Symmetry: D2
């Protein structure tokens, strides 16, 4: 099942879409500068691009870490990003009441992994009618994602993306089960599956070289998109991902 | 570090405290009946007791599933439990705005494991000044429980209970690391550690397994045991707790080495 | 099901048996000195005791690390331990051909975890008719132990002990699933289950306090025995204090009927 | 570091080598038939090929289950495979004393994962001087493979292949850490790394899974693949080769 996000087609058989940006919105000027860099590199390679940022991030590592500019200013910034670059945007929500006003502006709304069982939030997100990115908890098996999907369906929204972020592996560490992508596709109606490589590595060319190996591995399994918190470095990385993706997506799925 | 909860002393070298009750509040009369049974059993065995229940099941598998009586009716039921039996109570909270009204009534407020990184909820819980029960996420190592403790300390509340509920073990299965209790004591300032045996087992009769697991955890010298009955059958409660108390008494009588 | 090992009754409802000793037999006099300490302490507390050591340690951290005294001298040392102290002994075997000579001398023979799928070894061990200790691999689930037991049964030997040593938990780390003991009892005909606390902790960074916590926890589930190693591994002088606490818990647990 | 195996170059920046065959040797004719199919498919796709089989099933569910032809008959069959097809072969050894006679015939000898810490077997294997395939235990971290390599080096053999077979993931299940390949390269002197897809999946249709997993691992840039595996082998290898050729043509970053 494909999802149209303005002029982008997101689907496990379509050219991969990059989801990237910055962690938390600080100002219009800094957001535009970072967005402009992603836009320039992705335009140069022809890769569809969706800008990601939080306006109020509720799960930072310290209680006094800046959570972002907040809803009202955050949405003004997203409006300007959309107007300037003509791209879709994605942000996370954690309060039911925030879902509607965010969905006026942001093309995709993201359900944080740890909140993915929270019924009130799921319902409020579903009822926006927007495209939703469901972050897969590290403690949920891929065959259980169908249960979250079911709750969105009961609440009237099928425009759902499944986002892999790794699985708990002993203490501290995460492993990405490359078989889980296929299990999600088979059990969840071939909804678009995207790969959050950055979180999948947080517990581990150094880190750059790891992120490349892990991203290539995941994309080899035929995915709708790649998701980062992460210059000539981005360009070189995307060149390699686009090469693999083009090869994979050009071949028919097996008989 | 011990914590006083009314007349109860909760601590890792004190007689164990039972946090027991039910999954979700459904009605006044059924709650009072179940609570009466826990009270009469615990009082005769001389085990300190705190009644547990949720007023809302916030994360059920269907949007149409029964969720419980809800906050307003739930707090009325807890007020009646306290007035009738004179015991402390514990319940979980899922949103910041609920923390102040719940804390006015409920002696211990609980941080659900999946929500333990939500800064807004940690701050709202901390600011109540109530005793807080921190459910340890299944995906968090025992040496990282200190990170959750740190956040509560930064928000000005040190009356914290660390509650084991198992660790993720492959897909859809949990294992309880009996060594993690010690790690949590050593790295979190010897705050009271309790063991949620019920949720530790949910992924795998079960009566015999609950007893074996509970006895194993309590062997490591813990402040308390956390469990649910309807979950153990309610009539086996007395026999179960006779065994747990026999082991706790023995362990607690041996000098720490 | 109980197993008699000379005058010792080994079983999940009997007073726990200590299997203890050393990693590798390296000398006569030092072995006897270590054994003498375990004997003195276990006699003092009334705990049944079986002396454990390897005569050939197959899994050394370097290839030229001393393997141990080898089969022929190793068996002589075991004979001396038996003659001097009057206790049973346990050792591991690695090859079919070693099963008969080791079984003539040793009261229990042990199937190393990594070798537990080797059919030739399982048959040769079974055919000795000796009591066998089966080490549970860290990568085998407790419900799979029955398949090793089945093979011993097909080969005509039911005098089997099942020995927990932990389960793989992420990379280079072990957890002991306290529920596995019960799964093994239920699926393997209530054969004696013992706990190797030493090898269950090898991947953890003191260590004395960990060994005690882990040992108590396991013994709380009602087990036939505890399996450990010391060095002159627990320090050998702390043995009495450790065993006092284990015996206290075991006596309490064992004195209460199983809860139906 | 590359390893020459007759005319094949095995290395993490070389075209991938397929190691494939059957579980256990049962008879000459059935072995030749299976080998012929692999040879025909790999030749027409231009993929270097090493035939794999066990002469002994050391590891069965009944004491009365079939064990395979055994060492002496097994080595006769391997000699015939080599003579007929002119390809290298690989087999596993489980006891020190088998290492020299097996190594006289088989180009690559394989150290079973469960036996990888058995010092006597490591030394006996090393002393043959043959190419050795070291199966990574499902319980060992990739950064610990360097300690096995060190033992083979101390024993005088550096012609070592590291082989991924998955990692224990709770009870009765395996997961493959796609980051472990890189860790093994970085810490073990860029010895060839190959991927045993078959044994990585044994605890998990299945054909589609094997393809996804094989594509994912080969994306990390590897020397070779194990595939025990309508024309399924051919269809699978076509896709693997396309991805391998692409990956191997990109400069290392
Ligand atoms: Cl998560
Ligand atoms: Cl709870
Ligand atoms: Cl959890
Ligand atoms: Cl041992
Ligand atoms: Cl093992
Ligand atoms: Cl293995
Ligand atoms: Na004997």
């Amino acid at each position: 099942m494909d999802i149209k996000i303005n002029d982008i087609t997101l689907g496990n058989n379509s050219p991969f879409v990059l989801f990237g940006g910055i962690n938390v919105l600080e100002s219009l000027d800094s957001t535009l500068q970072t967005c402009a860099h992603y836009v320039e590199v992705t335009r140069k390679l022809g890769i569809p691009y969706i800008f990601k940022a939080s306006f109020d991030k509720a799960n930072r590592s310290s209680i006094h870490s800046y959570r972002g500019v907040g809803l009202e200013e955050g949405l003004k910034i997203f409006e300007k990003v959309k107007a300037e670059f003509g791209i879709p945007v994605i942000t996370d929500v954690h309060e039911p009441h925030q879902c509607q006003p965010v969905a006026e502006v942001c093309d995709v709304i993201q359900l944080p992994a740890r909140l993915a069982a929270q019924t009130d939030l799921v319902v409020a997100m579903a009822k926006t009618g927007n495209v939703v990115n469901i972050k897969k908890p590290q403690f949920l098996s891929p065959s259980q994602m169908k249960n979250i999907v079911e709750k969105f369906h009961e609440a009237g929204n099928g425009k759902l993306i499944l986002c892999e972020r790794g699985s708990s592996f002993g203490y501290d560490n995460l492993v990405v089960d490359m078989l889980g992508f296929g299990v999600m596709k088979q059990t969840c109606g071939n909804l678009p599956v995207i790969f959050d490589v950055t979180h999948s590595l947080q517990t581990r060319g150094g880190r750059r070289a790891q992120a490349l190996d892990l991203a290539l591995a995941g994309m080899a399994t035929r995915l709708a998109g790649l998701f980062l918190e992460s210059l000539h470095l981005l360009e070189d990385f995307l060149i390699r991902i686009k090469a693999l993706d083009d090869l994979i997506k050009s071949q028919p799925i097996l008989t």
